[PDB]
A paper describes a structure:
In this paper, we present a strategy to fuse specific, high-affinity protein binders to obtain multivalent or multispecific scaffolds of predetermined geometry. DARPins are used as building blocks to confer the desired specificity to the construct. A series of rigid connector modules replacing the DARPin capping repeats allow to combine the individual DARPin domains in such a way that their distance and angle can be altered to test different geometries, bringing the binding partners of the DARPins into a defined spatial arrangement. The two helices are not just joined end-to-end, but instead the two domains are made to overlap in such a way that the joining helix is stabilized by contacts with the domain cores along its entire length.
Constructs off7_H09_3G124 (crystallized at pH 4.6) and off7_H12_3G124 (crystallized at pH 5.0) diffracted to 1.9 Å and 2.4 Å resolution, respectively. In these structures the ligands were lost from the complex at acidic crystallization conditions. DARPin repeats carry a conserved TPLH motif in the first helix of the N-cap5, 23, and protonation of the histidine residues in this motif reduces stability and weakens the binding affinity of the DARPin moiety, leading to the loss of MBP and GFP from the ternary complex.
Residue numbers in the entry: 12 to 327
Write the structure that this text describes.
């Protein structure tokens, strides 16, 4: 198309008048190059804020991707055009769009050292844990490119993300956790005392958070400072369903904490009968005795939970 190429060339050169005249004469605002480049791509690439706004007003696709997968936001970040980045976000640009190599706008900003653009992409929900085709994150690219201010900025964002996923698990919000998962969250990340989101989820009974994390790759046998597998914390609080899911995904029945207790101990200590039945079905060792020399039968009789001691002897 004749008018199309002229519009592309006008947006790149920064000729607002020609841009307006060509569109006034029927030039498609979303004209496509042979590589998929649109005039918005070239205006955002060149740093022409006025043209960018003009094109968007006339219906420019804010999320157009060329053959390599770059969007106007990729290009604005690639060249460090803060004002354009903001305008593209105001107009509904996908902050977490990925090009062919897995790079997102945050990757590019972190790679080229555009601190102010990093800050803005975060404020608008940029995925901090995204990994490109080469398994590198924006923080990895800041480190490899010697952008230390951005490195510290992104490291603190990962930490803040780590605490939110702990609260959202301790609170019980699936979709609120799921948005953090899609934001690049490390489900296997723990706090200072080795407590993961799967721990706090299995302990408080905010179910279904348990299933997603295990399907995401959360280590079922993650042990905290006290050697507690999430299966331990679920046995005490008395949440049946969670017990099956963990054992359903390779959890260990004979997992021993620092004290030497297994989920069968903690279920016989508390007084949750229906728990021990499930454990016994999975070869839960009734002979296992902790460092106190006590067996799950000893704790069943110490706390006087007779119904438990009875069934423990039938299976012993």
């Amino acid at each position: 198309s004749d008018l199309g190429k002229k519009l592309l060339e006008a947006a790149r050169a920064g000729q607002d008048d020609e841009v307006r005249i060509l569109m006034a004469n029927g030039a498609d605002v979303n004209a496509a190059d042979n590589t998929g480049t649109t005039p918005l791509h070239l205006a955002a690439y060149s740093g022409h804020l006025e043209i960018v706004e003009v094109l968007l007003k006339h219906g420019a696709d804010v999320d157009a991707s060329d053959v390599f997968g770059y969007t106007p936001l990729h290009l604005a970040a690639y060249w460090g055009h803060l004002e354009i980045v903001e305008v593209l976000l105001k107009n509904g640009a996908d902050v977490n769009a990925m090009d062919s190599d897995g790079m997102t706008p945050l990757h590019l900003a972190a790679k080229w050292g555009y601190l102010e653009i990093v800050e803005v992409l975060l404020k608008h929900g940029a995925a901090v844990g995204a990994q490109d085709k080469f398994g590198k994150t924006p923080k990895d690219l800041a480190r490899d490119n010697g952008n230390q201010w951005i490195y510290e900025l992104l490291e603190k964002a990962e930490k803040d993300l780590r605490r939110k996923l702990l609260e959202a698990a301790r609170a019980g919000h699936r979709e609120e956790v799921e948005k953090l998962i899609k934001l690049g969250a490390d489900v296997n990340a723990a706090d200072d005392v080795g407590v993961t989101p799967l721990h706090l989820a299995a302990q408080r009974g905010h179910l279904e958070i348990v299933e997603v994390l295990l399907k995401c790759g959360a280590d079922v046998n993650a042990a905290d400072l006290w050697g507690q597998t999430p299966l331990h914390l679920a046995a005490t609080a008395g949440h049946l369903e969670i017990v099956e899911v963990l054992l359903k995904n390779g959890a260990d029945v004979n997992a021993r904490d620092n004290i030497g207790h297994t989920p069968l101990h903690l279920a016989a200590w508390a007084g949750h009968l229906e728990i021990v039945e499930v454990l016994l079905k999975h070869g839960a060792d009734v002979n296992a005795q902790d460092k106190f020399g006590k067996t799950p039968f000893d704790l069943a009789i110490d706390n006087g939970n007779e119904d438990i001691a009875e069934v423990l002897q039938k299976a012993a």
